Design an enzyme around this catalytic site. Structure first.
Site, short mmCIF file in Angstrom:
data_model
loop_
_atom_site.label_atom_id
_atom_site.label_comp_id
_atom_site.label_asym_id
_atom_site.label_seq_id
_atom_site.Cartn_x
_atom_site.Cartn_y
_atom_site.Cartn_z
N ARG A 151 -11.93 8.56 -22.32
CA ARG A 151 -13.18 8.27 -21.62
C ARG A 151 -13.92 7.12 -22.27
O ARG A 151 -14.64 6.36 -21.59
CB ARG A 151 -14.07 9.52 -21.58
CG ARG A 151 -13.94 10.35 -20.31
CD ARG A 151 -12.65 11.16 -20.29
NE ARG A 151 -12.28 11.58 -18.94
CZ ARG A 151 -11.07 12.00 -18.57
NH1 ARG A 151 -10.08 12.09 -19.45
NH2 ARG A 151 -10.86 12.35 -17.31
N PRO A 328 10.77 9.64 -5.19
CA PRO A 328 11.01 10.02 -3.79
C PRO A 328 10.13 9.20 -2.85
O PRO A 328 8.91 9.15 -3.00
CB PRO A 328 10.64 11.51 -3.76
CG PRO A 328 10.78 11.97 -5.15
CD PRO A 328 10.36 10.81 -6.00
N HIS A 356 11.04 17.69 1.24
CA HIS A 356 9.75 17.03 1.42
C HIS A 356 9.93 15.63 1.99
O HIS A 356 9.21 15.22 2.91
CB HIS A 356 9.00 16.98 0.09
CG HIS A 356 7.58 16.53 0.21
ND1 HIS A 356 6.59 17.34 0.73
CD2 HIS A 356 6.97 15.36 -0.12
CE1 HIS A 356 5.44 16.69 0.72
NE2 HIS A 356 5.65 15.49 0.21
N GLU A 357 10.89 14.87 1.46
CA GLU A 357 11.13 13.52 1.96
C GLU A 357 11.76 13.55 3.34
O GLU A 357 11.46 12.70 4.19
CB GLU A 357 12.02 12.75 0.98
CG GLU A 357 11.40 12.53 -0.39
CD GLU A 357 10.15 11.66 -0.34
OE1 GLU A 357 10.16 10.65 0.40
OE2 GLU A 357 9.17 11.98 -1.03
N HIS A 360 9.09 13.97 5.86
CA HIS A 360 8.40 12.74 6.20
C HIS A 360 9.14 11.97 7.29
O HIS A 360 8.51 11.40 8.19
CB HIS A 360 8.25 11.86 4.96
CG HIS A 360 7.15 12.30 4.03
ND1 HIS A 360 5.82 12.10 4.31
CD2 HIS A 360 7.20 12.92 2.83
CE1 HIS A 360 5.09 12.59 3.32
NE2 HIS A 360 5.90 13.09 2.41
N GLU A 384 1.33 13.76 5.09
CA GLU A 384 1.86 14.49 3.94
C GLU A 384 1.85 16.00 4.13
O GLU A 384 2.61 16.70 3.45
CB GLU A 384 1.08 14.13 2.68
CG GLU A 384 1.22 12.68 2.25
CD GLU A 384 0.34 12.34 1.06
OE1 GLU A 384 0.14 13.23 0.20
OE2 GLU A 384 -0.14 11.19 0.98
N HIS A 487 -6.29 6.74 -8.12
CA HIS A 487 -6.70 6.49 -6.75
C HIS A 487 -8.00 5.69 -6.68
O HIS A 487 -8.16 4.85 -5.78
CB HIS A 487 -6.86 7.81 -6.00
CG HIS A 487 -5.60 8.61 -5.92
ND1 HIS A 487 -5.10 9.33 -6.99
CD2 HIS A 487 -4.73 8.81 -4.90
CE1 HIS A 487 -3.98 9.93 -6.63
NE2 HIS A 487 -3.73 9.63 -5.37
N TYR A 497 -6.12 14.55 0.20
CA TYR A 497 -5.55 15.72 -0.45
C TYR A 497 -6.26 17.00 -0.02
O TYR A 497 -5.61 18.03 0.17
CB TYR A 497 -5.62 15.56 -1.97
CG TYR A 497 -4.71 14.48 -2.52
CD1 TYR A 497 -5.08 13.14 -2.48
CD2 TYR A 497 -3.47 14.79 -3.06
CE1 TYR A 497 -4.26 12.15 -2.98
CE2 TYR A 497 -2.64 13.81 -3.56
CZ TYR A 497 -3.03 12.49 -3.51
OH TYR A 497 -2.21 11.51 -4.01
#
Lengths: 597, 194
Positions: A151, A328, A356-357, A360, A384, A487, A497
């Protein structure tokens, strides 16, 4: 004859030219990720710059077609993507400064490092070292040093850079008829001109606020459990009624409790599901994992993959001379060409990641028939969220028992289920209020209600109230913790998310009902249920031609985020967490800190 | 025409006349060297029993998805503005994927097609003009822009194209039974001499 022909002809002209130009940039990106070379990265940037210039010049004719008296949604959505100027509204000096700030913030974050007071010569970088300190290492001293010095070294330096980022971005957003850059992110779910399915930009702040309090009954029960378990590990710093320190969350940013599973094991003497040894015993390879993964997608009723799909896909790293990106990544090279990059290994971790891929690709291949400007997702959540529901069903032991990986003699009870279910809540339940916390703070910064001097002051206030987390050392006005996130520094939206997490269980409950599954959703399995895939493909094919609320109304039974299927998935978990807190305090008390005296 | 070295564009579709010969139609049916084969009105194996006056072969290359537009009663960019067939089409259509032959890195720009036209074509009509499609009242002055669009565009026949975008060498076989006597018929069987 009419003005509509100009829009129909212009979009058709753009859809013909932008289609080929974009695939040149997409295919150039494929070559770079498959072979990281100076020649591939150059053509990758040149192709992207080429398609980028085409988008700016095409906005000239896009703005000459007013949508004030137009009812055709197909013409409205396509032109609105080009009518927006974006960063071109400001002068080049302000835009170049923004990239210089983002380039500087990315370098300060990526090259950030913390070193020990007792070993200045021996220390680590951001990745892979400091991630293991918060994830793997269980030392109170190493976790505290990695958090506090990070920090000071990275958080403080990013504070003055984040100011110019917020100020310059608000000018860009406000020029495009927005309140601030926070409202710009909220405009992704914007809907207008459709009766019964419109959506305002400010509705997202109300949805995350309403769904947050609905998550509090589940989060407050798990937080006391995680605090009670960590209190036994650190009794001289954690009070049974107080808050959890920020450096004991499991990562360098306080988003997931996935790394605290070893300290929060419900039943350390019960077994769990793991088909890693099962796959190695049956002589499985990276190809068979993808092939056997495709068996699940056809059984549920979704389309199959082509021959060029598997033949041109990547399954490992082709040597160090031509090292490829092992991350991935589901690619859409265009012209019906789809591929995935992945360095798959024989283990349950890559077994679910492959699904998961592949999930997509089922998204993009569905709406491939739409126009190019509408050949994209309706929003960030749908992209997602659909990938997780497919991997979650495959992780169910009912599917592994059907394929033949998990043996049929594997006993199942409420005990073994809670280890898998509680471990997931550390990822889901232990992250949902944090995304609402961070984005609410950022949204207030973009609007300008929080002064720049009160960033760390209000950040510490929001942490004690919303999530119940406290820092290990008090921070003054010079610190800026959320600026040190990937992000935030790289100009991304983290609210997806929160929406993806709730949308995941929404689609799951809709498909579990299609599969006629009764009981909690954590035992759900849509394998060999042809109607489940058919119900999904009806939603995937829409792309972004219809309202995203209409995709939810006809599938999951709502028009916005909801917490109802969240409790259904974690239904027996709530009873478990309800019991374990009989020797603790549900919720938290904001008056406690580890540095209290 | 089925295995020509080079094919004509869609909007500039070429044509080859067949007459004064014996035409064995069962060869292509049993060849299995095609992607799609459908005849209208007459089975492909029965054509050898019929004699005709004139038979034409309209040759061109299209994408996979555009093959559905070549049929009686269809509509679309290719059926309306490039190559139209009549509602009474009783001919045949053969298609053969030529991605390994005609596709080129960057796209075969020699095969082009029309996207917009001021009026719909007639059956077996051809138009290779470069007139700018005018939507409004203003003049285009030979350059596209606001309410002006260049109607001809090239195909993206690249090797990475899918089933719906790859090149397909298509040939349309139109038959004609006119008042004039026949000129081409199928082969007649024979046997030994007893």
């Amino acid at each position: 004859s009419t003005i509509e022909e100009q829009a129909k002809t212009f979009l058709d002209k753009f859809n013909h030219e932008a289609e080929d130009l974009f695939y040149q940039s997409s295919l150039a990106s494929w070559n770079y990720n498959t072979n990281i070379t100076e020649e591939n990265v150059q053509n990758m940037n040149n192709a992207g710059d080429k398609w980028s210039a085409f988008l700016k010049e095409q906005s000239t004719l896009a703005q000459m077609y007013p949508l004030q008296e137009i009812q055709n949604l197909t013409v409205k959505l396509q032109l609105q993507a080009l009518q927006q100027n974006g960063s071109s509204v400001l002068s080049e000096d302000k835009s170049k400064r923004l990239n210089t700030i983002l380039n500087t913030m990315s370098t300060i974050y990526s090259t950030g490092k913390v070193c020990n007071p007792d070993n200045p010569q021996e220390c680590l970088l951001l990745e892979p070292g400091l991630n293991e300190i918060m994830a793997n290492s269980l030392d109170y001293n190493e976790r505290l040093w990695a958090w506090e010095s990070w920090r000071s070294e990275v958080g403080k330096q990013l504070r003055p850079l984040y100011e110019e980022y917020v100020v310059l971005k608000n000018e860009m957003a406000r020029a495009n008829h927005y309140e601030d850059y926070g409202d710009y992110w909220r405009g992704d779910y914007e809907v207008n001109g459709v009766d019964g399915y419109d959506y305002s930009r400010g509705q997202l702040i109300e949805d995350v606020e309403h769904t947050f309090e609905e998550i509090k009954p589940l989060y407050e029960h798990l937080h006391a459990y995680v605090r009670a378990k960590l209190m036994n590990a650190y009794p001289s710093y954690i009070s049974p009624i107080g808050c959890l320190p920020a450096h004991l969350l499991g990562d360098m940013w306080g988003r997931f409790w996935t790394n605290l599973y070893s300290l929060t094991v419900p039943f350390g003497q019960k077994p769990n599901i793991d088909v890693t040894d099962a796959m190695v015993d049956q002589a499985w390879d990276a190809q068979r994992i993808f092939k056997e993964a495709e068996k699940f997608f056809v059984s549920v009723g979704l389309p199959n993959m082509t021959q060029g799909f598997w033949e041109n896909s990547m399954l490992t790293d082709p040597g160090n001379v031509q090292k490829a990106v092992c991350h991935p990544t589901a690619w859409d090279l265009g012209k019906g060409d789809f591929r995935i990059l992945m360095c798959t290994k024989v283990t349950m971790d890559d077994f679910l990641t492959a699904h998961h891929e592949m999930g997509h690709i089922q998204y993009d291949m569905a709406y491939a028939a739409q126009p190019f400007l509408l050949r994209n997702g309706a929003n960030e959540g749908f992209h997602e969220a659909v990938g997780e529901i497919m991997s979650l069903s495959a992780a169910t032991p009912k599917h592994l028992k059907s394929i033949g990986l998990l043996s049929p003699d594997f006993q199942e009870d409420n005990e073994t289920e809670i280890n898998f279910l509680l471990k997931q809540a550390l990822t889901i339940v232990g992250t949902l209020p944090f995304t609402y916390m961070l984005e609410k703070w950022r949204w207030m910064v973009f609007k300008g209600e929080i002064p720049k001097d009160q960033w760390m002051k209000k950040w510490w206030e929001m942490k004690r109230e919303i999530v119940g987390v406290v820092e290990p050392v008090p921070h003054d006005e010079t610190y800026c913790d959320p600026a040190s996130l990937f992000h935030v520094s790289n100009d991304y939206s983290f609210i997806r998310y929160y929406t993806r997490t709730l949308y995941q269980f929404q689609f799951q409950e809709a498909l579990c009902q299609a599969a006629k599954h009764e009981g909690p959703l954590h035992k759900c399995d849509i394998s060999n249920s042809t109607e489940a895939g058919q119900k999904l493909f009806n939603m995937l094919r829409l792309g972004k031609s219809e309202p995203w609320t209409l995709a939810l109304e006809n599938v999951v039974g709502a028009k916005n985020m909801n917490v109802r299927p969240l409790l259904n998935y974690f239904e027996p978990l709530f009873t478990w967490l309800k019991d374990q807190n009989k020797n603790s305090f549900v919720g938290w008390s904001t008056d406690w800190s580890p540095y209290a005296d | 025409v089925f295995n020509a070295t080079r094919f004509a564009s869609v909007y500039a579709w070429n044509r080859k006349r067949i007459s004064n010969c014996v035409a064995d139609y069962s060869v292509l049916y049993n060849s299995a060297s095609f992607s799609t084969f459908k005849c209208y009105g007459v089975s492909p194996t029965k054509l050898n029993d019929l004699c005709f006056t004139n038979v034409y072969a309209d040759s061109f290359v299209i994408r996979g998805d555009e093959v559905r537009q070549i049929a009686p009663g269809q509509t679309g960019k290719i059926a309306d503005y490039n190559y139209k067939l009549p509602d009474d089409f009783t001919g045949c259509v053969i298609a053969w994927n030529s991605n390994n032959l005609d596709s080129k890195v960057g796209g075969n720009y020699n095969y082009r097609y029309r996207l917009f036209r001021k009026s719909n074509l007639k059956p077996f009509e051809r138009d290779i003009s470069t007139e700018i499609y005018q939507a409004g009242s203003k003049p285009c002055n030979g350059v596209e822009g606001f309410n002006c669009y260049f109607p001809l565009q090239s195909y993206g026949f690249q090797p990475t194209n899918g089933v719906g975008y790859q090149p397909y060498r298509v040939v349309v076989l139109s038959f004609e039974l006119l008042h004039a006597p026949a000129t081409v018929c199928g082969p007649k069987k024979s046997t030994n001499l007893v």
